[PDB]
Design a protein around this ligand. Structure first.
Ligand code: HEM
Lengths: 497, 497, 497, 497
């Protein structure tokens, strides 16, 4: 059979002639019989002194932890990032310091709305998070398979996600929720167009691109900074599943993406992605026709060419999924010297959200979990204690800063980039920023006739279940992007209605 | 559209002609703008003083709680239990005190192995838990849609569940795990035969029966006791889904069971079940040909006739699914005077497991969550504090027993029934108890030729993916039940292989 | 005896004409005998079916929750706030709406460094937090018994607290930690001077003042803003305990403050405080000699006169301490319209810290705990679920914003005050702001000779246990405040050494 | 100064020849400035992008975990147990296999009622828990400084502890609660007598004995069993503190016990205890005049002589108290082959309670915490996952038992000892077992007149604050032990009242 199916057989074969280990309780006490409980006589009641039973059952009763609030369904793999080009003129980050430099990486792919147990081959964006274990600590590039997103302000994120998930009363998917939100928030037009196109359902994780999406900031050795976009293109080529094949596969194999990735790596077909960056100077940022920090916008390639940096290669499968994949945590705020945040409101919100949700989902000391540990860096600070403190807790080192006793010292070279911002400190409305121009270019130039047809068919197929008033407003938005876009969807809706 | 689809529309209409509430933070502070965050100028970074954002995001980051270790995918409804017959000669429980007596109930239906985003229409047993809010506290009859189970000793439960779930490394379903366990533990033959028959995939929750499965004990007003089995048969009739339709539905509508139940209740088609009991005297328990407390055995209806008791009616849908369904907790140990446990090893283990897992999944004070509260009884005791103590914690009442200050007193009439047991206190092996006799009767008499054909096809369709040595041992067990059972499966496996 | 001692006797008497409640399990099942466990025969082992035992023991095993990271030892009480003067020209907050308007309040007093079982009468600042349950949600004024604090930047807070607590290895109080930090961070001179003065150990909670400490912002109906300080002076008069009496009481009655407050309220001696504010216009903020938002500075009374506002009255004792006091949570970020944060770096950090620690200490849904509920306001928003969701979770109301289904709407009038700030976004050092001027005024003008004598004796009595190099550095700081301050301390240290 | 005081100085000196480590965030990113936060200009608000601040503050906000429900205040140390005599004829436990065999141990000493922060030198029993890291897993002998306890049934434990702690309304110690419980439950007479004697306040942890208290069962290589009692007598000699000195020290140094133990070990004065066992054959258990499994009874030395076994030596202090002491967990149920529980109801209850409370206080995977790890044993089983899974989670090993893939196997030689029982499974009352005989022997034969006088004085000094009716019932109990015991106490009470 395939490698995945033969997991146990292979584990057995590796043991070879070795005698089985002694079965023990959690406290390491050998177990005499773990197949029958202790009772008063053959047909008598169970005894409390059967600690073997309680020890095992109590742990079984505690196996589950909360699934991720979004991107719950996924797959993971490990490998490395290798620098192929010199971009030190832009970033001083150690991960990019020299051509040929390899940094270990951990990756998790995922859908967005579905819970654990949902199907892999469904229309939804795809998470493509990368953890770089650098000497300057971990760098988490928490990307998606799209360069943009549905909204441009983080305060609408919980609402958007709610609208994409289950109705609070019925617990069912709700087309009224989905489309009422999107039609009321037309900034979503760009990503909705990409979502409903062919790339809405990639053929597994190896056949899609990855993007940082947000504009980030790079700082060099001289303290000079530029803005950038991260891109990682699949070396296996873009490949998508038709709506029909995706539907069939969601029933035949809900874990299609997990299986495909595991088997590819197990057979030596290590997937790779070519890593690039787009660079925009501060001067160019002032002249960009849109807000360069607006997540619903892309930086046109003809104006901001992709610059090659390196390669991402996945060549190792997880040994224990729960420990290495379910428990892995990526924080966009994990950025080493040379890489910083941009003023993108969405990115700014994410700086808070991830460590926050991880403290809840995993625990206060989630960074102690092996897969999350910045193992290629010495963690030395003034943080102590907390639940499940699994390391030496920094021993007897002086726990306050500053101190006259030789404890860890701050490193001035690691100081962040200083910038002057103008304007009042308040809430600035961005609902009316451009919501259609780049979407028009996508519909007209990025897609061809047959792709536009499928796009309209995909949208109408889902939108038809929303109330007419919602259908009307959604169509009004599409029409504003392009009359052909709106009219084609309307014609399909008429047929359905 | 259907009621479920129109949930929001109906909520809106109910409010109609009245102003929307003021949007507030969790602390009740009115929100001026919850659509834009506070930034340093229109293109500057986010401020910590945007508490509206953090307050909302922090809660979003904490929405998820651990799903149930088993039976994670489900649907809920509410209604009542009504006594139709007098069984006070068997049980003094207040829930049965008089004909016509109505007791409010809460019910949750579910599959077993699949996680929260899995499909409803798959082969698996179905949970059918009933919470009776009685004057003597809550009585939780945590049943399944089958009168039996796969194993007869609780220490094997975690292992059985593990074998039914995901491979620890690949995170994929594993036929080797499933069948290695079942073939090595032939006591599973009886329930495996039922599982792979037509009733393995019921047409929604309204078309299946419910059973307490375990033998329980009933105690009357005179202190006399008998053993019993609880049965609740569908008044809507047994109806199943073909493998083909179940497969199609798992893709078309993974929430088929949830939708079906909600819409039935919303349209006034309240589903009901006729509640019965079988009674076995202590004398009969001594002469029963098998262990009457063996969960892999049924009490033949010819020898132990069904005695009608009342009816279960579900006439109310949940208003908020998370609060009323995801958070509901059923403990088999919640039994009021008149109903007690039997020596069934499986039941004995469950007495511990449920409250234990609930303290983890929900929290130490999970009984304080509205849907879990014994609202028709006054909780008065010496228990105090704990996380999220959401009631006045019994005020200033003396917190130790005994006391001379008028605090709660034990009630002699609530004392449990006493039975004498003799024998060595040790682990008694039950692996070699009868594993085939009742299974033969099911295969030969309960099923007919066409049903036996489908049973063998369903088993072979799944078992064919397990290694040959596993298929062989499995077939050996089936052959022991009946040579036709094993040979038919083998013939089908021969084709597949 | 005193009211506190007679708590149980009074509880008993209050229900003399009633029979005791029936003792039940957590699920409301009546208990027959809660004085003996179930065993097989008189001297046989314990049975798992003794669910009465497990239910009670399991809850006992979960009684404790984490104590507050700081201010762990405290006392609580309830009452009201009454407006007595009109300050609507400064703040539009509903709590100040009309003279005569009463608002319910909850208060918690506490020490700072000591854990839960520590003594009340010890040198340490005193917490004086006030929760106002207003119609515009809860307003939490989390003050101390001092107008200033030891540091002026929140990032040094964890270090400061660590220095004040136990050595990480020995778990003992450490004078080297205390004074190494204070001597290296001389901005602490002002509050250290207050701390070691006679007011360092107040005679209970009723004989001390309360202050918001931080500069806050008030906004009126016209959108005009001013900066303010909150002061609440004791109507019972300032009264302190001598070092000797405090030491004796810490042994005789570690709960002196708790007992004193309870008995005063129980005997009708309701303690009260007169509430005032200081006002500083934005223009005055420009001319202030120091940073008006520097927490180590006060606003001189002659320059900024106290303006009376109202009264704080405590007239109700807690019924259950754990539920109403141990579980109470105050968040400085809970500010209703009309009251806002100032740029005080320390306050800014607290905006994040409290809700954050509360989600940990109490739980994600801590605002649903009765005492923390903004019961005078209707909480309506788009937040849902989370562990121990204790209400109907807002039912079936649409859960995303914006929506076309009548769910909660934002209120523009509640929009925050806009301000333009100048300067780069970076880390500005404040270690070198003035650390001695206001301290000199306190030493020279506020204190008299005998008070200066005790201040020096109190400091020297503790500082004498720190290493000589730490003593030298500390004295150097005190000398900069005033040569007598340092020399008197040095003279005493020479004596101790 | 003393070693404890010079902790930081020594840590600094040990690293004199090294540069300080680089201060990093939790994720290992170097910190440029951890003394000032990022603001909008020098007097502007705080930015969310100051991740250094949030990362540190969020951890500070989560430092605390629930303190132990009982025995919260303590001290810890490490060392070894060395076998000096051969008791293999009684027990096959590997910890006793041969003379000269050393097993690493971890010890925690403590008081009982006081919270963390309470004083060490107060009247209360003292915990003396010993963790033996053996090849057969961990063996936890969770003893006290007394051979007996206040009660003989575990269901009264939560009540007893409640009566010993704070009043639920006032949060104060309550003499009425303490004595109402003790007077109503006279089985407490024996331990109350020990508690109020000179040994009620030992001079530190090194000057007191340790006892397993309960009767345990020892099983040898031939499967033969005997009952036993564990005793570990101080080699430093019994030394107690007077009521006066204890009171003064409770104020001068609440951490007297912690300091004393740390300095003793730091200076090379390693404390030791001589380990003994008492042996009672099953025949003798049948003839014992009292219930040999009654926790309020001792086995007289003349009839059951102490048999030397080995030595407990503490020669290593904790490096980090929180990690090694606050987080240490002892489970009485952690018993290796050769050591088993007896029918003692109290012990039976503790088999459940400890692992249960640990899953709450520390977490589901608390056995993963370094100090709790059975590091001298290979943990191999079918347990998986759970929050904070800090190990490899047993990799890809088959997770179900039985299995055909070479995973861990039960060890028949680890099977527990079988004993036959016969009796009703019910609640047998033990309130009326002998409550005075052994107490009389203590009062009359063990103590002298000088000691009896202090015993009566210590009791009366506390009992005087309980109501008169409680004083009378308590005195009636003491009178039943001996008329002089009651009359002397009554005389002192008369003087006090
Ligand atoms: C020794 C065997 C068993 C053990 C240890 C066991 C354990 C569990 C556990 C730990 C849960 C999760 C509970 C929660 O998180 O709310 C569960 C759920 C469930 N089990 Fe069992 N179970 C066993 C046998 C059975 C049997 C024989 C039945 C039926 C007669 C059954 C019916 C159910 C149902 C219906 C649920 C879900 C209840 C709900 O809807 O919330 N279980 N079981």
């Amino acid at each position: 059979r395939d490698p995945a199916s033969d997991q146990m057989q292979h584990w057995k074969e590796q043991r070879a002639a070795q005698k089985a280990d002694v079965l023990t309780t959690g406290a390491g006490n050998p177990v005499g019989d773990k197949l029958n409980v202790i009772t008063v006589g053959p047909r008598g009641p169970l005894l409390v002194q059967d600690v073997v039973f309680t020890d095992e059952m109590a742990h079984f009763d505690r196996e589950r932890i909360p699934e991720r609030v979004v991107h719950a369904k996924g797959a993971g793999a490990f490998g490395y990032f290798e620098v192929t080009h010199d971009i030190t003129k832009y970033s001083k980050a150690k991960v990019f310091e020299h051509i040929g430099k390899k940094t270990p990486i951990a990756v998790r792919f995922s859908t967005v709305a579905g819970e654990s147990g949902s199907a892999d081959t469904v229309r939804d964006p795809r998470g493509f998070a990368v953890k770089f274990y650098t000497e300057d600590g971990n760098w988490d590039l928490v990307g998606n398979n799209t360069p943009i997103f549905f909204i441009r302000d983080p305060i609408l994120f919980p609402s958007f996600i709610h609208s994409q998930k289950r109705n609070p009363q019925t617990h069912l998917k709700d087309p009224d929720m989905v489309w009422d939100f999107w039609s009321l928030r037309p900034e979503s037009l760009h990503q909705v167009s990409f979502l409903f196109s062919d790339r809405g359902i990639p053929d597994g994780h190896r056949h899609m691109n990855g993007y940082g999406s947000h504009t980030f900031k790079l700082v060099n050795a001289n303290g000079e900074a530029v803005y950038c976009k991260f891109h990682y293109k699949t070396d296996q080529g873009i490949k998508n599943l038709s709506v029909e094949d995706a539907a069939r596969l969601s029933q035949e194999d809900p874990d299609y993406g997990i299986r495909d990735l595991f088997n590819a790596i197990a057979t030596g077909k290590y997937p790779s992605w070519t890593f690039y960056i787009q660079v925009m100077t501060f001067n160019q940022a002032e002249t960009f026709p849109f807000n360069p920090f607006d997540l619903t916008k892309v930086w046109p390639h003809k104006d901001y060419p992709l610059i090659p940096v390196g390669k991402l290669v996945l060549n190792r499968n997880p040994v224990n999924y729960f420990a290495e994949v379910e428990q892995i945590a990526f924080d966009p705020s994990n950025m080493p010297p040379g890489i910083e945040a941009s003023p993108d409101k969405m990115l700014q919100g994410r700086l808070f959200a991830y460590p926050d949700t991880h403290r809840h989902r995993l625990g206060p000391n989630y960074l102690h979990i092996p897969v999350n540990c910045p193992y290629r860096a010495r963690v030395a600070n003034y943080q102590r204690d907390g639940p499940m403190c699994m390391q030496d807790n920094q021993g007897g080192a002086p726990n306050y800063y500053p101190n006259s006793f030789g404890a860890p010292e701050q490193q001035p070279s690691a100081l962040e980039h200083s910038i002057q911002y103008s304007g009042e400190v308040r809430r600035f409305n961005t609902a009316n920023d451009d919501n259609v121009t780049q979407v028009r270019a996508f519909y007209v130039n990025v897609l061809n006739e047959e792709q536009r047809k499928r796009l309209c068919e995909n949208i109408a197929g889902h939108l038809k279940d929303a109330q007419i008033f919602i259908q009307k407003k959604a169509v009004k938005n599409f029409t504003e992007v392009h009359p052909d876009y709106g009219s084609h969807i309307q014609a399909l809706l008429d047929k359905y209605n």
